[PDB]
């Protein structure tokens, strides 16, 4: 029958409950987040260390010792998996690092594997394994060989 029209039951989140866990204000937005038994504005759920939006990729956060953390910060604080690609030593929390491609380095470790010079802004380089090689070492290799 074309005359048949459905009557659906709707169970909404009550407007009183929609207070953000990060700013304590009402959420009147259509799109928002649920996490750790709270509701949040998309810009109100941040990493306690770095302050990035927490579930943007992978839809998960990492909670330990009263800290909501992103994957990398969680592993920097608690995980054994935060070693540098050059010196093979653990990356301290609150430490700024340099990532070339998929490998991570200390800034003092961010130097050429051959001539040992510290890289400057705009320096061309090549990454072989976990070794970064400067352009003038690539040119000096190919000069002897052709």
């Amino acid at each position: 029958d074309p005359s048949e029209e459905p009557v659906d039951e709707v169970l909404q989140i009550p407007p009183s409950l929609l207070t953000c866990g990060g700013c304590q204000q009402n959420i009147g937005d259509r799109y928002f987040l649920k996490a750790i038994d709270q509701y949040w504005h998309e810009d109100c759920l941040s990493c306690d260390l770095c302050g990035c939006r927490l579930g943007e990729v992978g839809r998960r956060l990492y909670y330990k010792l009263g800290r909501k953390l992103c994957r990398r910060d969680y592993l920097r604080l608690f995980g054994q998996d935060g070693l540098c690609a050059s010196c093979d030593k653990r990356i301290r929390a609150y430490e700024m690092t340099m990532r070339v491609k998929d490998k991570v380095y200390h800034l003092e470790c961010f130097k050429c594997a051959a001539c040992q010079k510290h890289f400057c802004v705009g320096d061309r380089y090549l990454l072989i394994n976990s070794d970064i090689v400067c352009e003038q070492d690539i040119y000096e290799w190919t000069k002897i060989n052709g």
Partner: nanobody
Amino acid sequence: SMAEVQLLESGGGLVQPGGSLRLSCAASGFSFSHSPMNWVRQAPGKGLEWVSYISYNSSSIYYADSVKGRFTISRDNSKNTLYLQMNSLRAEDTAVYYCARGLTESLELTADWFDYWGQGTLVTVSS
């Protein structure tokens, strides 16, 4: 369809010890409002030295020990500008100061110069 990333550092110059400078960086070509920003300096011979970090909404802010209590980072997302207030300047602060775009997750820089780094502005504190 891809816009070119641009970071233009302003301010800086020559001043005496105890002097003060205000650095600015105008940004375009990426969503600045969703990007953690940095100031990173460099002298010749010496490697790159990170100075200060600021999260997209300014909720997280960090400084190098050498600059704590002297330098102040800030941003204005509506104007796409990053700032650095440099006070109580000393000879060790002499370097080229770059505005560096950070990776979105967990205090990281990247060596993609074209997409994440400016051309820098020179700061010099006399002998």
